[model samples]
Target: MADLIAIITPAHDNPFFKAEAVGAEAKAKELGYETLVMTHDDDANKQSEMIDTAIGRGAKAIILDNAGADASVAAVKKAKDAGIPSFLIDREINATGVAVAQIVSNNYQGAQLGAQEFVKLMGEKGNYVELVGKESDTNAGIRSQGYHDVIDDYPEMKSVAKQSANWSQTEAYSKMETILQANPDIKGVISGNDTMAMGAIAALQAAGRKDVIVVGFDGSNDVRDSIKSGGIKATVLQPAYAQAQLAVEQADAYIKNKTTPKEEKQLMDCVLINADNAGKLETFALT
Candidate 1:
C-alpha cells in the first residue's frame, strides 16, 4: 500500500487555501502516496485534533497551513513527537526546527508591491484605510508594516482608519461598511488578503463608492476577476499552488531517503497582478 500524506489547512471556502490543499494532494498522488485532506477552520483545538487523526492514520508526512502562529507550535511539536514530519505552508509557527520545512510566500515583499501600486493609483496623496488580517497570524503584521513602509513615505497620503477583520470575508464586509460611515471621503484601501479585498469591494459597491482605489495581497481568482472587471485595482500574487507542490516533493524525498532540505525556511517571491495581467492568473498562480 502507498504511504499516506495528510493535507490540512484553514477552511477551503477561501480559494487560496483550497489551492494549497489541492496542490498538495495532486503532488502527493503523483508521487505514489495516498492522501487524507482536512480543514482546521482556524481553530487551534481542531487543528490539534486533526493532527492526532493524521498520526492515527500513520501518515508519512503532513502538509499544514496551520491555525495560529503562536498557538500552533505545540500541535506541530506533538506531530513531531509522533514520528511524523510536518511541512507547513502559508503561515509559520512561532518556534521552528520542529517542522521539517516551512514553505511560504514572501508576504512582506508582496505587500510592498501592492502598497506601491496603491500609492500610484491614489496619486500618492489621499485619505485611505487599511484592513488587516487575523491578529494571531504573523503575516498580518508583516504585511501591514510593509504597506506602511511604502505608503507612509508620501506625506500627502493620510490614513483615516485601520481595523483587523480576522481575515473573514464577512467580517471584512461588515467592518468596511462601518469604516465607510466615518471615512466616506477616503480615496483608497489596502487589504491584507484577497478575500478581505472582495469583502471590501462588495461593501463599497453597496455603499455606491466605486471610485475608491483598493489593493490586496494574495493573488486569487476572485480578485483576478475583480481586477479584470475594473473592480479592485491591484493585488500581489503569491505562488500558493507551486509552494504546496514543492512541500509535497520535499516530503517525498524525506520519506524515501530521510534527507532534509538545506534550509528549513523557504520563501517564494510574488508578482503584481493588475488589469494588464489579471487574465493570466488562475488558482493563485499566474499562467
Candidate 2:
C-alpha cells in the first residue's frame, strides 16, 4: 500500500475550512497517497487524539487547521516526535520549528485592504461596530489591529463596540441584535470573517439599518451572493483552496526529497472583493 496523508480541519459550517480539506485531499490522491480526512470541530483534545491516531496509522504526513494558537503546539510536536511531519493551513501555532510547514493568509495585510474599503464606504468618518472572531484565534487580533491601524487615523471614525462572536453565525446574530438595539447610531460594521459579516448584515436588515457600510474577511460564497444583491459592501479574499494545495505539494516534496518548497512559515496575500468583482468568486475562493 502507498503511504497515507491525514487531512484535518474545523467543522463544515465554514466553507473556507472545507475548501482547504478538499484541496489537500485532491492533491494527496493525485500524488498516489491514501488520504484520511477528519475534523477536530475546534477541540484541542480531539486534535491531540487525531494527531496520535495519524501517527499510529503510519501517516507519512498530516495537514491541519488547528483549534487554537497556543493549544496546538504540543500536538504538532508530538506528531514530529513520531516522525510524521505536520503541515498546517488556515491558522498558525504559537511556536515555530514544530510543524514542517504552515501556509496561511496574510491576514494583517488582507484586513488592512478590507479596512481601506470600509473607510471609503464610511467616507472615513462614521461610528462603526466591529465583530471580532473567536478570542482564541490569533488572526482575530491581527485583523482587529489591521483594521484599527487604518481606521484609527481617521479620528472622525469611532468604534462603538468590539465584541467577539466566537466565529458563530448564531452568536453573531444575537450579539449584533443587541448592539444594533443599543447603538443604532453606528454607521458601519466590520467583521473578522464572512460568517459573522452575514450575521451582521442580517441583523442590520432586521433592525432596518441596511444602509450601514458592511465589510468582512474570508472570501466566502454567502458574502459574494450578498455583495451581488448589495447587502455587503466588501470583503478580503483569502486563497484558501490554493493555500491548501500548496501545503499538500510542500508535504509531497518533503516526503519524497526531505525538503519543503518554502520555509516553515509562509503567508499568502488576500484579494479584496466588492460589487465590481463579486461575480468572480466561488465557494470561499479568492480569485
Highest lDDT model number:
1
> Model 2, range 197-270, lDDT digits (tens) per residue?
98999988998888988999999889999999989999999998889988899999999989975578899989
TM-score for each model: 0.99, 0.97
Predictions in order: lDDT: 0.94, 0.91
In terms of lDDT, model 2 sits at: 0.91
Candidate 2: where are CA atoms >4 Å away?
none
* lDDT score at residue 240, model 2, on the 0-100 scale: 88
Which model scores highest in TM-score? 1
Clashing pairs in 2: none
